[PDB]
Amino acid sequence: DVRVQVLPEVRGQLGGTVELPCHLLPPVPGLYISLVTWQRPDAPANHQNVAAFHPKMGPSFPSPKPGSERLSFVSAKQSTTEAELQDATLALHGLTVEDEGNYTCEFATFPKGSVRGMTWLRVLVPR
Amino acid sequence: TGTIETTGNISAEKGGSIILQCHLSSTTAQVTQVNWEQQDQLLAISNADLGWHISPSFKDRVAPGPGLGLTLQSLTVNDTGEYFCIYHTYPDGTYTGRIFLEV
């Protein structure tokens, strides 16, 4: 019923800001998004969870790489009023060669369960 | 950051009952949701606010509890396989534990 819409590959220049789109579709009434988590499946155990968003608490960045300084949630908003976690688009400011890789966006929902989508980040090199 | 402890590689007899338990230690992260899953099958969900939810496919063979654990009732030889406890937490992220059951 519920699915994750993500781009298969996202290309971005070195140093520039890029967007990793993640959307939970279609909007189902009665379905509650308990958590949103961005993960790097290639990175080690202590560097898996790069970004997370809670409907009440808001955003958090557990991994120090890329960290809070280079990451941000584009449209995700917390409740103060109801929360909107449907749009899990992540922004990557100051792109480096280490950021090139796989990014899995996961939605912890009730009662449908867990739904995820994966995107490859292609860091373009100049000269 | 933190770690998940399991009941380990459990062994059971046909027709009986067994307990699948997981515990997240070495972190104070707010446990928003606990998912009891298999490779490509969802058994049960435990939400901190919305409560428990059991899949219709396991509604007559699974009991919720103890705590954030699962109770498998009337065990069949088909119940053999890997079981996963996925902990959705804030701010740490997503923790995963694996349990192998043999009937």
UniProtKB/Swiss-Prot annotation, chain A:
<feature type="domain" description="Ig-like V-type">
    <location>
        <begin position="1"/>
        <end position="121"/>
    </location>
</feature>
<protein>
    <recommendedName>
        <fullName>Nectin-2</fullName>
    </recommendedName>
</protein>
<comment type="function">
    <text>Modulator of T-cell signaling. Can be either a costimulator of T-cell function, or a coinhibitor, depending on the receptor it binds to. Upon binding to CD226, stimulates T-cell proliferation and cytokine production, including that of IL2, IL5, IL10, IL13, and IFNG. Upon interaction with PVRIG, inhibits T-cell proliferation. These interactions are competitive. Probable cell adhesion protein.</text>
</comment>
<feature type="glycosylation site" description="N-linked (GlcNAc...) asparagine">
    <location>
        <position position="102"/>
    </location>
</feature>
<comment type="similarity">
    <text>Belongs to the nectin family.</text>
</comment>
<comment type="subunit">
    <text>(Microbial infection) Interacts with herpes simplex virus 1 (HHV-1) mutant Rid1, herpes simplex virus 1 (HHV-2) and pseudorabies virus (PRV) envelope glycoprotein D.</text>
</comment>
<comment type="subunit">
    <text>Can form trans-heterodimers with NECTIN3. Interacts with CD226 or with PVRIG; these interactions are competitive and have a differential functional outcome on T-cell activation, either positive or negative, respectively. Binds with low affinity to TIGIT.</text>
</comment>
<comment type="function">
    <text>(Microbial infection) Acts as a receptor for herpes simplex virus 1 (HHV-1) mutant Rid1, herpes simplex virus 1 (HHV-2) and pseudorabies virus (PRV).</text>
</comment>
<feature type="disulfide bond">
    <location>
        <begin position="22"/>
        <end position="105"/>
    </location>
</feature>
Curated annotation (Swiss-Prot), chain B:
<feature type="glycosylation site" description="N-linked (GlcNAc...) asparagine">
    <location>
        <position position="9"/>
    </location>
</feature>
<feature type="glycosylation site" description="N-linked (GlcNAc...) asparagine">
    <location>
        <position position="78"/>
    </location>
</feature>
<protein>
    <recommendedName>
        <fullName>T-cell immunoreceptor with Ig and ITIM domains</fullName>
    </recommendedName>
</protein>
<feature type="domain" description="Ig-like V-type">
    <location>
        <begin position="1"/>
        <end position="101"/>
    </location>
</feature>
<feature type="disulfide bond">
    <location>
        <begin position="22"/>
        <end position="85"/>
    </location>
</feature>
<comment type="subunit">
    <text>Homodimer in cis; binds with high affinity to PVR, forming a heterotetrameric assembly of two TIGIT and two PVR molecules. Binds with lower affinity to NECTIN2 and NECTIN3. Interacts with GRB2. Interacts with NECTIN4.</text>
</comment>
<feature type="topological domain" description="Extracellular">
    <location>
        <begin position="1"/>
        <end position="103"/>
    </location>
</feature>
<comment type="function">
    <text>Inhibitory receptor that plays a role in the modulation of immune responses. Suppresses T-cell activation by promoting the generation of mature immunoregulatory dendritic cells. Upon binding to its ligands PVR/CD155 or NECTIN2/CD112, which are expressed on antigen-presenting cells, sends inhibitory signals to the T-cell or NK cell. Mechanistically, interaction with ligand leads to phosphorylation of the cytoplasmic tail by Src family tyrosine kinases such as FYN or LCK, allowing subsequent binding to adapter GRB2 and SHIP1/INPP5D. In turn, inhibits PI3K and MAPK signaling cascades.</text>
</comment>
<feature type="region of interest" description="Homodimerization">
    <location>
        <begin position="9"/>
        <end position="19"/>
    </location>
</feature>
